[PDB]
Design a protein around this nucleic acid. Sequence first.
RNA 1: GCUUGAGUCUCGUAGAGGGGGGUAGAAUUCCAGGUGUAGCGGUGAAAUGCGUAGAGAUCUGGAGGAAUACCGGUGGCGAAGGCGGCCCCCUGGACGAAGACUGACGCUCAGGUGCGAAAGCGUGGGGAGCAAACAGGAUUAGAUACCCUGGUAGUCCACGCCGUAAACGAUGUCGACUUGGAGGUUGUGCCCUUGAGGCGUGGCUUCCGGAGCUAACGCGUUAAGUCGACCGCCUGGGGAGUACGGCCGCAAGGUUAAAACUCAAAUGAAUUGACGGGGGCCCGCACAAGCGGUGGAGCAUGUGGUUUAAUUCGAUGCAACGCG
Lengths: 70, 117, 151
Amino acid sequence: PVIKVRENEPFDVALRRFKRSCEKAGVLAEVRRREFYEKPTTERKRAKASAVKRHAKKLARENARRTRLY
Amino acid sequence: RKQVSDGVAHIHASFNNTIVTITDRQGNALGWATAGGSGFRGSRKSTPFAAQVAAERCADAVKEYGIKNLEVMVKGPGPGRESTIRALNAAGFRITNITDVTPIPHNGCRPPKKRRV
Amino acid sequence: PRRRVIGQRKILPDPKFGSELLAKFVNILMVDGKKSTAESIVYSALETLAQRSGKSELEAFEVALENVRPTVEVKSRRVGGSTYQVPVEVRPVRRNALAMRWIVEAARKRGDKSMALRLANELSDAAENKGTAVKKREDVHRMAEANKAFA
RNA sequence: GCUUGAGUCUCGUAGAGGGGGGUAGAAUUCCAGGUGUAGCGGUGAAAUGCGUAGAGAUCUGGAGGAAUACCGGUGGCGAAGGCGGCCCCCUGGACGAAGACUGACGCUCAGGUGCGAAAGCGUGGGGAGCAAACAGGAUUAGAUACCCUGGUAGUCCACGCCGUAAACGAUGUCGACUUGGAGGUUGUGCCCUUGAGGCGUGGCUUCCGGAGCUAACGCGUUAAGUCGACCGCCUGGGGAGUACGGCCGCAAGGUUAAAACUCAAAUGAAUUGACGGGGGCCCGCACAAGCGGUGGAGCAUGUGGUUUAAUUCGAUGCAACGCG
């Protein structure tokens, strides 16, 4: 995205702020999705599989990972 | 041997090759350098070191022009951009500001099919 | 190995003038546990060298040894299954032993009237930079320069 | 007759529900021009391909077609198929509040009709990108495959046909009843909005679990529990959703739907192992780091073969072969 490095600013500061800009915007993820056509089946299955993984470790975080091991 | 103070650097980084092209601000180029222009063929063309060497060759490609400072535009993913702009001032420059100008469609055209291996 | 990092062996120093470097060299050059023959070859190679150079024995051996000195090595690793050679910065203790190994490997060839005369030819040929051990060092350096794309 | 089921009206709401027409921005390709020059592209590596006839890069502009990043959600709407920029026109349904009105108008449904992804077919357009077929380069023992470079129908539109899908929560529709918890979404009422609140009540939805059910897995108030109404369907595996006939279709084919023969099983769920070019954690001269060998020479010795009258017998992958 747009970075303007003004007066009294070093080099690697500006480079890291540009990397922060790229990781805020997520431009490389949005290019990495658009290299190959994922079918709408694969889109919906990826969405559901990531969601069931997400909450199925989340409820384990909430009550299963709260009881001691030793 | 025409002189102009400030210009624009365009670092088009693909996954196979990085091309550095230093233009003026009206888009007109002054000379270019690639990750395959000197040695560095094949698997060694995709590395960040190849992009660093490409920036170092495009640095001497504008020795006649005498560029004081340039804004750096960055396109495409891949092991290009950060090593390139880090070697860009190491070869001697003042990078004024940095843009990420990579194309993003708004679902415009269909990509090719996913590879099996 | 798989687990241990055990402490190093400690050898006894060089008898003629006390050094660990020359004791490592007589240990590298030897054959079938014949220490006395190897140290005879080493001494008759180094006293016969210091009159070819002009300096004394030890530091003439040291700048015959440091001209053949590998700054980097190559290695082989795995990231994609591709398995390429990547260069590495060597520790100096194995750098020095690889230098002595290359000097002995040079001296086993180039055949003439002795082993000690072969060594006194080899170390001077390395100390003015025209040997074959310097060719081994600059070939290692070339193979690391070609592979500098991976680091 | 009655108002409890079913409906009608008044007021709002949320919505990728649908059909028609516009329009915007990003991007890909192409064309024309400017700068500038030897690579680009691709791959695991390459080559085919493109490029000194000036590419790729880069900037200004044009022309087209298609799809609508972010929002975006285990979000929403729709009977299902399905539906994603924004605006307008036409239009369907669902829900909530308090009332009023009709007064059993209901539920289900064989034949019947309608809708029904994608691919396909017909006619007429359109054609950027992608891309069956096809071609070339690889890889390989081979490679009419995966990988690469191209590339036609098709995908898009208008109007017709086809009528099938793992059309799937593999779960017909409707109604009744039966412990709980965390959420999401959309109405609505009350209390002090006294503060990004609380206490309620409706619809839809997501997960986890209780009894109960179930072969088990699991389901569990959105049931696969406890019941009632109607419908469709099953009767071992293969032959076979095949043949013949009928009907439908432009065809591809769909629908309906056997038999002879053949086997003594086919199957479902789970269990203990073993295995994986599955995952994680480790170990061993297993690899790496080194040193020295063997395979080449000559002899010693053992074996296989061949020979012999006999070349006694046994061991004969690691774990037989200087072995008994």
